[PDB]
Design a protein around this ligand. Sequence first.
Ligand SMILES: NCCc1c[nH]cn1
Ligand SMILES: NCCc1c[nH]cn1
Ligand SMILES: [Zn+2]
Ligand SMILES: [Zn+2]
Lengths: 431, 431
Amino acid sequence: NTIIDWNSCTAEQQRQLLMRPAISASESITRTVNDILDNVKARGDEALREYSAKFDKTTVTALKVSAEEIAAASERLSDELKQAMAVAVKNIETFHTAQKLPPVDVETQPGVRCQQVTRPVASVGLYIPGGSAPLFSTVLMLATPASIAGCKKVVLCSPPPIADEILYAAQLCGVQDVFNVGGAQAIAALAFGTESVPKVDKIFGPGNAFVTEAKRQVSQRLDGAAIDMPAGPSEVLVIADSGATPDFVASDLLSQAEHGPDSQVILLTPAADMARRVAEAVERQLAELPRAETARQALNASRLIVTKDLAQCVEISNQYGPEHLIIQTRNARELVDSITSAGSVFLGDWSPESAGDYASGTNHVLPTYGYTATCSSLGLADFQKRMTVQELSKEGFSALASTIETLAAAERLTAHKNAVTLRVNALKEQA
Amino acid sequence: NTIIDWNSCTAEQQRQLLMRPAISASESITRTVNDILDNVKARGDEALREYSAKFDKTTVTALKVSAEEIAAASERLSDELKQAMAVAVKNIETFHTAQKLPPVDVETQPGVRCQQVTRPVASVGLYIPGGSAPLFSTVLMLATPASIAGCKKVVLCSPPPIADEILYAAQLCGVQDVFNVGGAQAIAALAFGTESVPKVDKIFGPGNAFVTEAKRQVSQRLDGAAIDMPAGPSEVLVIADSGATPDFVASDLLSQAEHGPDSQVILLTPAADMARRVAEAVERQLAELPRAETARQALNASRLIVTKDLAQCVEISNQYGPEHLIIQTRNARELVDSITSAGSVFLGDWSPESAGDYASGTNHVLPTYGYTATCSSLGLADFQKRMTVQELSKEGFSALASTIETLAAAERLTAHKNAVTLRVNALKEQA
Ligand SMILES: NCCc1c[nH]cn1
Ligand SMILES: NCCc1c[nH]cn1
Ligand SMILES: [Zn+2]
Ligand SMILES: [Zn+2]
């Protein structure tokens, strides 16, 4: 509970109110993940099978899940679920396909043709945390854009035994191979490759501390691979005016809170009345949540802030740059233009966070922990790259030659200048 | 050396040729850079003047270059040079402006509106190495896309004294502030901010080993900033058939070679006679280069490979993924489609590397050292952020509610499910 009267706080107390958790990061895990990587790179599968004893009694046999196993899993899933996933995929597919960069083809000057084309990332590996109730929805979020971009190889790793939901999810999005491996060793297998797991160009998907560390390390190693983005605690910031519904606001704060004890939960409202009613609704709803220890633990760091007006809410939100920004105001749409920093925005009272997590079609893999400053939500662009192309006709080149020689000359790049002179002389002789 | 017959090499040798040299780490430079960064964050300008004091004979006083000094440097440059930069900027501007993303606004289904909007990175800092032969053109390549993106603040740091060309290039592209600082201190200054230098969100521009390490470190620190891309030796790969002009091929190889003793220059040709002629052309042209010790050393690691046919040329290039791909073949454009990985491609006899470096309009800040596998040429997108926005109407939310609950329930995220139920019930009540 405890409401915060923003304008009664000192300037320092304020910045302190929104400060994100400090990064502990123990060397313990840095060295541990270091052993794991080196070991996986050198002794491939043999190393993997070994770790397949240490953590979780899996004693993995064949690293790759068979087509029969996937089929057996797909049969045990209800039609309701299967149909639910087809809806999500269809919408996610529609949104990402819409992100395709239209071809760039222009002549900056007559005869000087410059283009920007797209090429897909050759191969991508998808990591999915295991457990009893895995977040299989992330499979749809990673594998669908990978499919749309035209990635030649799309593979997925997850701690064995892999739940039926993940198997079916992978299959539905066309994942080629699913491997029984997890933790820091699954990341290494993807970055370095083994006798069974292929080396990929980019690794996608969040996970625990070890997985996060492993991704960080393989992203800084020449022998490793690139990653989708750095990690950080998830965040949600709700802006609510006097017209908002306390229960709706609370349900979104709680949705975020139930993700992990480290979740950042923030409410901004110009009405003390609203802040108080939201705190009450949070209390009531919390009491009905089953496994609600993390939600309560996350709420210990929450902030229910009362601002002087709506503009101040936007001002605070922009400084923070939240992963998820939910605008439950009466003219939500109009505020979008003034929002300069957020991962994903949800407008109105009928756009719950959960809608974006599962079926609106947007991607729920977003930048957080302040990275909204320069990084973007996962989209088509993260599974491809922009390649430029240029062709100068004899005319275009001749028209630019002098400019190029002058510049190359000012930078003291003789060979750069000579490449031009040689060509101009060749043309003079053929003219 | 002379020439390499690809198909005469063993499978093992062929795999070694495609690999690039390994960097290092030097705990000494990492530690040095670490102390520099911390010292700059803790003691600002005073700390910067202590460094300037030891590295130069004239300790810097005012860190910000005056508008007065900028006008003076501008008057000292020739009209020829100034006009040339204007041509470059104009073409660079035209190409990057054409990269503006069209609106992404779609209804995955009735009442479920999903958009992708862009927002500029608020502040960016550009670094430019100093010295005798300053590559001022990089200023045009960095400041131009920044201006187009709409970045609110653009500042530049360069080791004093700062050449007139840089100052002019900066003014020309609207760079707001220029600061007399270089090396790892400038990066630290931009990443942390000091009394004079503003803290920026992202840092652009390559530099020496200390700059590189400084950029790696600030990109990893939470109190740091993002960077454009990791560095590595520069490269060029030329594919040439029997119709290519030896001297043209050679001049491009030399253009790249003169960029640094670590440059990688490669030739892939189906004709053994072409390889020999190019090798001789390279030696003859090298003899005329004023100071080509750099070019000379770089050529020691060059590779002039004779292949079976162009198909094999493309296959090898794609596995390598060169920073610059130059195609001097009869059917140049026809091959582009087959090119799956390259930073920037040049087509035909009249598209010298030099043309792209200075005036075609494409960006010459490109991914190298194999980063072409997932990284793109610098472009408008690097000075922006993609933000997702969604709004479901009551109808849209109502039609998608069962799907969300089903998926939420499947992931055992009760609060996520409850956020839907509450809304559904509120709508029944209403009507
Ligand atoms: N941050 C992950 C979003 C998610 C997955 N499932 C539900 N919510
Ligand atoms: N790789 C830097 C491109 C350049 C600068 N000037 C000429 N060439
Ligand atoms: Zn969620
Ligand atoms: Zn060059």
